Amino acid sequence: MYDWFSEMRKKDPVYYDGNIWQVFSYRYTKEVLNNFSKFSSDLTGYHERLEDLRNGKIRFDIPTRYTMLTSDPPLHDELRSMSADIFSPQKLQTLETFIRETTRSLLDSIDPREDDIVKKLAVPLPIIVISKILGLPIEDKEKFKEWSDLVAFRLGKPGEIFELGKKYLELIGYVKDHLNSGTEVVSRVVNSNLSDIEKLGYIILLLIAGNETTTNLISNSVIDFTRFNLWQRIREENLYLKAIEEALRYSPPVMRTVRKTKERVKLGDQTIEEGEYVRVWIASANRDEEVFHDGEKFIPDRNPNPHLSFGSGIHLCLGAPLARLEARIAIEEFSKRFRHIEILDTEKVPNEVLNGYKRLVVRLKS
């Protein structure tokens, strides 16, 4: 649907189709994302229940409705400041050896003749890394794999209520079980003025917000580098940093995000009424010809590359530096292991927001 995106960017960058508003151009998607006053992220009733949560009036509820992702400032900033430096440059420098050793370990498990790199590399890496950072027992990776499906970007589908109930029951129980054995990261959260439900929500967000997305970055990168035959060049010219950024732009793990109008507002030539949902197409903005010359092409050394794959504004992905580091080390170590790669079989996740692969079977020549 990238051709439909281009047509919309040209004729209706801000389009109303009866029920929701949709934005396709780079200029307007960025404007929406940055104007948090007009375009709110308070879509889960968080602000409305903050008083009763902090009072202990609400005792039970789905914890994932109360995270920094579904909040506007000042609440949003009060929450985010508790972990603003979790992925600081110094912290990541120190994690480099652990991340590199971990992917080398995962690569060691790959059978060159024919293996699934999503299963052996892309899925485990982010999970193992976040577990170390949070101080949660890696010995529960498989469970973590299951719970990663709960990431907020994923919308509902019929017949999942029982399955989801099971995961929530286990996940919540696990977090409550390890709230006081985590790193300073979780300690600061557990020792704040937040209600119990919010603490749960906060820890779950940090635990699952980047698993499927980071996995998708690695998978999408492997697919793009292979299909456009760039492995040789990337190693040769050391285009890892720029190439991964071009994968993020071209094959964004998250296709779009949503906002709700906080009052009548004019975006472009349109006046969006108060209380309307606005779908922001990150994938389309990333192809905007005005901002990305030859945007329909995968240019490995494209520079600069101001894509919106991690968002923009106050909710700009907290894990961006980590995701970038993990993916880079993954792709570097992988490239150093094979002389030729061949994609034998793939299976794509069936979702309109999360963009990635469920299976990626390849054959490698070490």
> Per rule CB under 6 A, is residue 102 in the interface with ligand HEM?
no
Q: How far apart are CA 83 and CA 254, in angstroms?
A: 23
Buried b (16+ CB within 10 A) or exposed e, 55-70: eeebeebebbbbbbbb
H helix intervals, 18-160: 26-34, 46-53, 75-80, 89-108, 117, 124-134, 141-147
| Of the candidate residues 234, 323, 329, 331, the single one contacting ligand HEM (CB under 6 A) | 323
C-alpha torsion 43→63→153→67, nearest 10 = 60
- Which segments are annotated as binding site for heme? 76, 80, 257, 259, 315, 317
| Of the candidate residues 151, 217, 267, 329, the single one contacting ligand HEM (CB under 6 A) | 217
Between 42 and 364, CB nearer to ligand HEM: 42
- Give the interface segment with ligand HEM, choosing from 56-64, 223-231, 316-324, 348-356 (CB under 6 A): 316-324
Footprint of ligand HEM on 262-291 (CB under 6 A): none
| Of the candidate residues 311, 328, 330, 341, the single one contacting ligand HEM (CB under 6 A) | 311
- Give the interface segment with ligand HEM, choosing from 17-25, 284-292, 307-315, 347-355 (CB under 6 A): 307-315
Strands 257-261, 115-116: pairing kind: unpaired
> Per rule CB under 6 A, is residue 214 in the interface with ligand HEM?
yes
Between 49 and 328, CB nearer to ligand HEM: 328
Q: How far apart are CA 130 and CA 135, in angstroms?
A: 8
Q: How far is the CB of 257 from ligand HEM (least distance, A)?
A: 4
Between 195 and 220, CB nearer to ligand HEM: 220
Distance of CA 281 to the CA centre of its chain: 14
Q: 257 with 17: CB under 8 angstroms?
A: no
Cis peptide before 304 (omega within 30 of 0): yes
Please give the structure tokens belonging to residue 35.
């104007």
Q: How far apart are CA 185 and CA 190, in angstroms?
A: 9
| Of the candidate residues 80, 100, 167, 359, the single one contacting ligand HEM (CB under 6 A) | 80
Q: How far is the CB of 209 from ligand HEM (least distance, A)?
A: 4
State the residues that interact with ligand HEM by CB under 6 A. Answer: 41, 68-69, 80, 130, 205-206, 209-210, 213-214, 217, 253-254, 257, 309-311, 315, 317-319, 322-323
